[PDB]
């Protein structure tokens, strides 16, 4: 028959006569709440984050950024250059950054254990005014075919500043995929 | 060319007591002053009255809402 002309001899009833659940104190099994390949990953993800964070506190107490033998000269005078090509000769780095002013001392950092060039150096100008002239001009320079950035070294100037390994620093060349453009420079 | 959306908007501004038929129910009808409507055709009334053809009793409901799928036919006053 049709849905409209169908004589419902026993239409849908309520549920008032069908409340026979279990008592409250009869609680559910506590151990029956877990999932695989969902929490063990988060558990391992939390430790690696915390383990480093705990390791960070130990390094700050032992090593002092300001009290560094390599670092020398006035902090506001010194300059920082990174993304430098490994083949850049010391004279090439002097002659390219001397255009903005005379360089009192230049320090190219090297790997402690491997000895390889780190790729960034610290340039100390004779006058504080000579450095600032390079801050705007040096940034974006092209040395040995690879673009280089230049910013005042904040390791001993900016309060609450720290490098990558301590969670700070700048630049996102290795941040979330498709979130930091490689063309843009500091 | 007048469309149902524009016509429903007119009845709303006029605040006329629009009667509505139910889906699968011929015996039951509802009438009230429409307040608003969405793309889903759901209609809200300020003072609804449920009238049955057999019983002829008008049950007062007040400010209520009605599903669009249940609507079958609109009628003025």
């Amino acid at each position: 028959k049709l849905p409209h002309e169908k004589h419902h001899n026993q239409p849908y009833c309520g549920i008032a006569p069908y409340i026979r659940e279990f008592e409250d104190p009869r609680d559910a099994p506590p151990p029956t709440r877990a999932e695989t390949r969902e929490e063990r990953m988060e558990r391992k993800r939390r430790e690696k984050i915390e383990r480093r964070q705990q390791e960070v506190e130990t390094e700050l107490k032992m090593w002092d950024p300001h009290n560094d033998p390599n670092a020398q000269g006035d902090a506001f005078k010194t300059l920082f250059v990174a993304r430098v090509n490994y083949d850049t000769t010391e004279s090439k780095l002097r002659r390219e950054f001397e255009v903005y002013g005379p360089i009192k001392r230049i320090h190219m950092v090297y790997s402690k254990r491997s000895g390889k060039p780190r790729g960034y150096a610290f340039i100390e100008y004779e006058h504080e005014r000579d450095m600032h002239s390079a801050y705007k001009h040096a940034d974006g320079k092209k040395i040995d075919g690879r673009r280089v950035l230049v910013d005042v070294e904040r390791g001993r100037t900016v309060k609450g500043w720290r490098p990558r390994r301590l969670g700070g620093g700048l630049g996102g060349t290795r941040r979330g995929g498709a979130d930091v453009n490689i063309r843009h420079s500091g | 060319m007048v469309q149902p959306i524009n016509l429903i908007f007119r009845y709303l501004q006029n605040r006329s007591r629009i009667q509505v038929w139910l889906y699968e129910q011929v015996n039951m009808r509802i009438e009230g002053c429409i307040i608003g409507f969405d793309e889903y055709m759901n209609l809200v009334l300020d003072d609804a009255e449920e009238i049955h053809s057999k019983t002829k009793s008008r049950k007062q409901l007040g400010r209520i809402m009605l599903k669009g799928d249940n609507i079958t036919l609109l009628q003025s006053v």
Binding site: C13, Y18, E21, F22, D24 | -
Partner: protein
Amino acid sequence: EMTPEELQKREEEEFNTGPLSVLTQSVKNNTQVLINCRNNKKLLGRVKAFDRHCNMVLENVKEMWTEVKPVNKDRYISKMFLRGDSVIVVLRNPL
């Protein structure tokens, strides 16, 4: 939807705070639940998983219904799969 991007997580927050959260806390706490379906029968059992379509994964269920004097009839199903469209009402353990 309001968020046409494929990375939209509207369904996520909906089951956590929306009306469908009754099933999440049931599977979380492993609490029983009574469901009224279009079969005029009531199904009392636990839930193990669900989605937006209101399709639950039940276990240890007990079907109950009545025919006609009115006689009651009940049976048991340890594992079954309930559809959403046929559902009318759901009721968790009010305790």
